[PDB]
């Protein structure tokens, strides 16, 4: 890595002495050392990079967003100086984008990634990084165009293949996504050994009837991406008790279960009133999990936040639930009504995290035609009764009754999570 331009080679001793202080952890000393070099040599790219790296380390030491924003600006200043070596220009801008994504400046990161692709049009990995920037903001269309542009030039790039297959699979192009996902993982290129790609390759194969799907779930399990072949959530706290079905006593949330079962008719009645008078509050499930039929949900809580307008449609239910922070505070779960009509089948699927358990309170359950499978066991609901399963295990639902099914879904923190973990875990 050639980081010194012609002038920087003539002050190589001073630059190495300052950088050695930063590698030793003397951050304040290194900050002032590079500050002096930037003063004496205001055009030095290596001195400016040292200033930025020291601000980067100082932000880590302080866990300070404001200090990191200063580092992000100094990484920019490096790129603005004359005669910046190509290796240094790329390092400074790549770190800038990486730190912008850390702060959540996803739009700003995108501008930095685009500039990197403009400066180095032959670096295919920078285009792949740009595609990740689009994926992080939720712009799958522009991400798809980026990887198609990469695959036009380098068809064998494994990173581009998995991410293209991921985009195709997200767009419900199930059959088309399989060879891109498969060949991408099989390439072994950096960035392809990711749990997201084993998860969706196996799921795509499941939807098309490919029996080789669980071979890829076992390979993902062997490489540390899945807790097991059945439990394939990707946002896990390791060690939590893993079983598909739970009894109320096993969860310890016996007071919540008692309240739901004592008061279930007021929950049902408000759900029915929304069906009859405000049906638009039920939104069709839009995560591509419905194989066929009609499936909608009316969400009262998500990420531990109460939807005020929705609770105006179920005020008594929300009042009852407010007494139970184990569900209203579950920032990795929801509280929602769920309606499924006859002819509905939900693809086998897995929730995102092992940090929640999912309760179903039966509200309107037809006598025949409705069942839910979790892992190897299929069960039925009962009106006014709570069943509890871990939806990080593969589960599946059928609705073949002659009228509608209505349930109340109440997520709780996994009981083995400490109060510390419940406060700090990022919301999902």
């Amino acid at each position: 890595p050639k980081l010194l331009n012609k002038f920087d080679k003539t002050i190589k001793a001073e630059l190495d002495a300052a950088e050695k202080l930063r590698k030793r952890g003397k951050i304040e000393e290194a900050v002032n050392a590079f500050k002096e070099l930037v003063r004496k040599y205001p055009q030095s790219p290596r001195a400016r990079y040292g200033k930025a790296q020291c601000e980067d380390d100082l932000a880590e030491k302080r866990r300070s967003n404001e200090v990191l924003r200063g580092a992000i600006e100094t990484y920019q200043e490096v790129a603005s100086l004359p005669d910046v070596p190509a290796d240094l220009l790329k390092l400074s801008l790549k770190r800038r984008s990486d730190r912008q994504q850390f702060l959540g400046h996803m739009r700003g990161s995108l501008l930095t990634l685009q500039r990197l692709v403009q400066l180095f049009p032959n670096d295919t990995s920078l285009k792949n990084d740009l595609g990740v920037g689009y994926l992080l903001i939720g712009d799958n269309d522009n991400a798809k165009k980026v990887y198609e542009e990469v695959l036009s030039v380098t068809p064998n790039d494994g990173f581009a293949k998995v991410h293209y297959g991921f985009i195709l699979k997200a767009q419900n192009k199930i059959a088309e996504s399989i060879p891109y996902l498969k060949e991408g993982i099989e390439s072994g290129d950096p960035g392809t050994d990711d749990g997201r790609f084993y998860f969706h390759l196996g799921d795509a194969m499941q939807r098309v009837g490919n029996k080789e799907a669980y071979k890829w779930y076992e390979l993902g399990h062997k490489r540390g991406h899945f807790a097991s072949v059945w439990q394939r959530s990707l946002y896990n706290v390791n060690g939590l008790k893993a079983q598909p079905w739970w009894t109320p006593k096993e969860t310890g949330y016996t007071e919540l279960v008692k309240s739901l079962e004592r008061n279930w008719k007021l929950i049902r009645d408000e759900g029915l009133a929304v069906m009859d008078k405000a049906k638009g509050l039920f939104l069709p499930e839009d995560e591509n999990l419905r194989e066929k039929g009609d499936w909608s949900q009316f969400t009262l809580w998500q990420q531990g936040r109460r939807n005020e307008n929705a609770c105006k449609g179920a005020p008594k239910t929300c009042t009852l639930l407010e007494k139970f922070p184990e569900t209203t505070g579950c920032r990795r779960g929801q509280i929602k009504y769920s309606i499924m009509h006859p002819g509905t089948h939900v693809w086998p699927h897995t929730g995102p995290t092992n940090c929640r358990l999912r309760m179903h309170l039966g509200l309107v359950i037809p006598k025949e035609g409705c069942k839910i499978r979790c892992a190897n066991e299929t069960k039925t609901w009962e009106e006014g009764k709570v069943l509890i399963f871990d939806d990080s295990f593969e589960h599946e639902v059928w609705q073949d009754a002659s009228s509608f099914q209505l349930i109340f879904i109440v997520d709780v923190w996994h009981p083995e999570l400490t109060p510390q973990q419940r406060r700090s875990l990022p919301a999902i």
Binding site: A59, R63, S64, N65, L68, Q101, F102, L103, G104, V132, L135, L136, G138, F166, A170, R196, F199, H200, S233, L234, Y235, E285, E287, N288, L289, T299, Q302, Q303, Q334, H349, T350, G351, P352, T353, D391, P426, A427, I428
Partner: peptide, 18 residues
């Protein structure tokens, strides 16, 4: 997009700095 019922999104969390 949010990962409520599944894992369809590229990332399911939202980074907001330290």
């Amino acid at each position: 997009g949010k990962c409520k019922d599944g894992l369809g999104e590229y990332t399911c969390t939202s980074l907001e700095g330290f």
